[PDB]
C-alpha cells in the first residue's frame, strides 16, 4: 500500500546491481511470466554506452516463458525507477504484468519493456551480471541454462568501474 512490486528479468536480477541505485529494494520472490520471450536489443537503434551491447526486453509469445525476481520497493522510489529505465527518452515503456511463484501464487508487478528496438546480442559483461543474478536468487536451473546459452557480442573493452568490480568478485 505504501510499497510496490517490481519484476526484473535483466541486470536487476543481481542484488548488488539493483542496490547501486535502489539500495532499499527487498527481494520478494522468484516468479515466472508466462507467454513472454526474452530478447536483447538496441532501443531506437542506439547501442547502450553503459553495456556496449543489446539490453534486455520481453515481448508476448505463446509457449515461451521469462523467469525473474520480484523486488519490493517504496512507492516513493517509483519516479526514480522510471528514470533508470529511460521511460522519458522512449527506451522502455512501463508495463503491468501478472507473474506466478513456484507455488502457483499470482502477483501483479510493475515492469518495463522496449517498444521500438533492433535485436542485438548482449555484451559478455551484461550477460555475466544477468547469469550471476539468476544463480544468486535461485531462478530455476533450466532457465539458468537458457541464460548461460545466450550468444553475446564480442565487446572486450572497458565497462564501468562499479560493473567490473561486481564481476571480479
Swiss-Prot record:
Name one molecular function that GO assigns to this entry: gamma-glutamylcyclotransferase activity
Q: What is the effect of changing residue 92 to F?
A: Marked decrease in catalytic efficiency and specific activity
What reactions does this protein catalyze?
A: an alpha-(gamma-L-glutamyl)-L-amino acid = 5-oxo-L-proline + an L-alpha-amino acid
In this protein, the active site sits at 85 (proton acceptor)
Which residues constitute the signal peptide according to the record?
none
Q: What induces it?
A: By geranylgeraniol.
**EC primary class:** lyase
- Highest taxon listed in the record's lineage: Eukaryota
Q: List positions binding substrate.
A: 6-11, 126
Q: Which UniProt keywords apply?
A: Lyase, Phosphoprotein
Family to which this protein belongs: Belongs to the gamma-glutamylcyclotransferase family.
Protein name as annotated: Gamma-glutamylcyclotransferase
Please name the source species.
Homo sapiens
What gene does this protein come from? GGCT
Amino acid at each position: 500500500e505504501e510499497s510496490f512490486l517490481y519484476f526484473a528479468y535483466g541486470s536487476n536480477l543481481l542484488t548488488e546491481r539493483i542496490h547501486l541505485r535502489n539500495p532499499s529494494a527487498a527481494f520478494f520472490c522468484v516468479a515466472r511470466l508466462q507467454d513472454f520471450k526474452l530478447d536483447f536489443g538496441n532501443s531506437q537503434g542506439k547501442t547502450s554506452q553503459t553495456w556496449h551491447g543489446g539490453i534486455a526486453t520481453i515481448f508476448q509469445s505463446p509457449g515461451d516463458e521469462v523467469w525473474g525476481v520480484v523486488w519490493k520497493m517504496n512507492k516513493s522510489n517509483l519516479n526514480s525507477l522510471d528514470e533508470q529505465e529511460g521511460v522519458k527518452s522512449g527506451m522502455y515503456v512501463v508495463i503491468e504484468v501478472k507473474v506466478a511463484t513456484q507455488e502457483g501464487k499470482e502477483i501483479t508487478c510493475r515492469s518495463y519493456l522496449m517498444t521500438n528496438y533492433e535485436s542485438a546480442p548482449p555484451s559478455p559483461q551484461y550477460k555475466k551480471i544477468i547469469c550471476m543474478g539468476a544463480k544468486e536468487n535461485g531462478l530455476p536451473l533450466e532457465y539458468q541454462e537458457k541464460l548461460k546459452a545466450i550468444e553475446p557480442n564480442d565487446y572486450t573493452g572497458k565497462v564501468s568501474e562499479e560493473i567490473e568490480d561486481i564481476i571480479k568478485k
